[PDB]
Amino acid sequence: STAGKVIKCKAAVLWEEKKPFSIEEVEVAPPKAHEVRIKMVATGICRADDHVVSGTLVTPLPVIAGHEAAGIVESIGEGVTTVRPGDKVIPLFTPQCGKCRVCKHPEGNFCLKNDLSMPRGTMQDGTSRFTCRGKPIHHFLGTSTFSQYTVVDEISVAKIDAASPLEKVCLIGCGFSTGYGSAVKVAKVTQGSTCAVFGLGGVGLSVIMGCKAAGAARIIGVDINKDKFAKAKEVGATECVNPQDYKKPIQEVLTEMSNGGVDFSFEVIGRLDTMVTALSCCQEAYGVSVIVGVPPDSQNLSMNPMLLLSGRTWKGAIFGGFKSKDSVPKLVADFMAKKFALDPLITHVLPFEKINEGFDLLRSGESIRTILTF
Template sequence: MKMTAAVMYEQGLPAPYEKSEPFRIEEVDLEGPGPGEVLVEVRAAGLCHSDLSQVKGLRKRQLPVVGGHEAAGIVREVGAGVSGLSEGDHVVMTVVAGCGTCVRCRSGRPALCEAVTLPRTKGLLANGQRRLSRNGQPIYHYSGVSGFAEYAVTMPASLVRIDPSIPLDVAALFGCAVVTGAGAVLNTAQVQSGASVVVVGLGGVGLNSIMAARIAGASIIIGIDTRPDKFAIARELGATHTLDGNDGDLAAQVKDLTGGGADFVFDITGAGPVMTYAPEMLHPGGQVICVGLGASDTRHDYNHAALVSQERAIRGSFMGSCVPDRDIPHYMDLFSAGKMPVDRLKSQAIGFDRLNLSLDLLNGGDVIRQVLLPHGRL
């Protein structure tokens, strides 16, 4: 079938992206679904800092590629052998999809499934197939999703069926922003009632961490960002305090507010300077949870002697240690109950014509979550 999609042919093009146009809006060919695959009509796709990282070339991808990894849509066709999904089902599309049989998957950690990671690094679906092309030339899949398109062929493990009453432009955010931010707090760190929490970076992922910390019962929730205009929504969503990341000794300010240091610091940014001071914000025995990703070869400095002598810990959280079939329905229940107002994170809806400009807005920190509507409407 023919469809419109946003295709990236080159990484590392300079900003402003409205001029360099890293995404070209083109008509491409989509085959399938083949056996074990699903065709989804993409109704909404979120723009994430991970998309921006790919545009900047911080982590290399097989090119050309149809972008987008956080999306929601409607199942239009299922391939032979697919069970549990039917035409007309509303689904969230997510990167977190394992093979279901390896040691990591069987231990409840599908985000770490190596069987799925290898084909995806080659721009293929988890089964090793490619369904995208243009004029007979191959186009590759982005993280098994490729949501910046009118339609997508993907694997069932990348899809979670949802209540059709949930608006699809909200549902899309659950595929990455929600599972990553909330999961870091509830799954990776397992924050307990009464804990003190610091969240550095108040974009879509960071604000989900703020909401999750409130749900977990954290007594002190400190949001840090270099953009004070984000502080109002951070406080609305659960932050008890906010600090300007441009200020002086942030570690001293956190220790003041927490009576000696926080239990958890969540670094959503992946920025080198943050990891220099984040461990210093902890009390003895506290943990830094690293959520944001920088370049694939990034190295960070920290005070190793203090880490050892005060038994602090630094650990990673990839996609919120998510188990999609378990976590996404749970988070949606929290949304429906008014406890996780994810809809408050939407900055604007856009069409393909504004996609590159929207990368500039994201790069400048002027928005929280923009949502692409590939068909121009829900």
């Protein structure tokens, strides 16, 4: 009784940067060709959403943000073949068109049809499906999950197992998969290795989980919020260090702790100084440093290229290096086979209409992931 109709729902609308989300009435157009309209079930509060509010990440405004979520398909567009109404799905902020050079490449997963390099904030067709107060609203990374109903392109949605728990697997839409894959797929952490993880948020804890499952012997967590240390050790960190506790830059301390440098370091914060510090603290002849955190907009860092000439490898990745549409259903199956845990990451559960409050939990440091439920 909704298929082909404009839907009546409510969504968290951002009107200007640095302002709270305005819960308002929105009009969600029905799906066009190769498009999917999804009833939302559960969505996470990711730091990347906050970067939109802070201006750290620049996308066209006004927008409905949100990108870490899982729901039920409400209706399908002309030509849709991968999902039907009633399937559980997870929208993909990194699409997998399957037709570009990156999708055919064995390693790449940053599909060229992505809306992240030059943000337009539209569907693949360049228009918007969202109307609030009669004005057109931008999409976010082709997902826009801060809504009871959203519409996504087919290449930005993955059908997942019909028995999966939606309040937990929504993190496979971003936080967990990014951190987990950064360790096991991007850095490719080895057995018996020593790792250093900068940032103990949701992504950073997932990096720790991946390092441990990869068989690392030492995992050093680094965070200026010592309240994060308990859960970091819970998921696998062997030690935690607070840079504010030392009179030396943390890279010397880490280099001394690791008897000459760690095998793998991860920057999971999004600051220029910690990216160079993370690179410096891995072993100069064979260390690998992976940038996961997002720096603010337009920022050049400074580094001495002698740090690389000695033998270091420096790399980054989106979404833990996973080809999104292929990997997400597999990761959900893995979760159901209890191959990894997601509950350590969920620190509270709130109803969706209280999106704004749950955000201040993130920026005040009490939370890892808050799950907004619908």
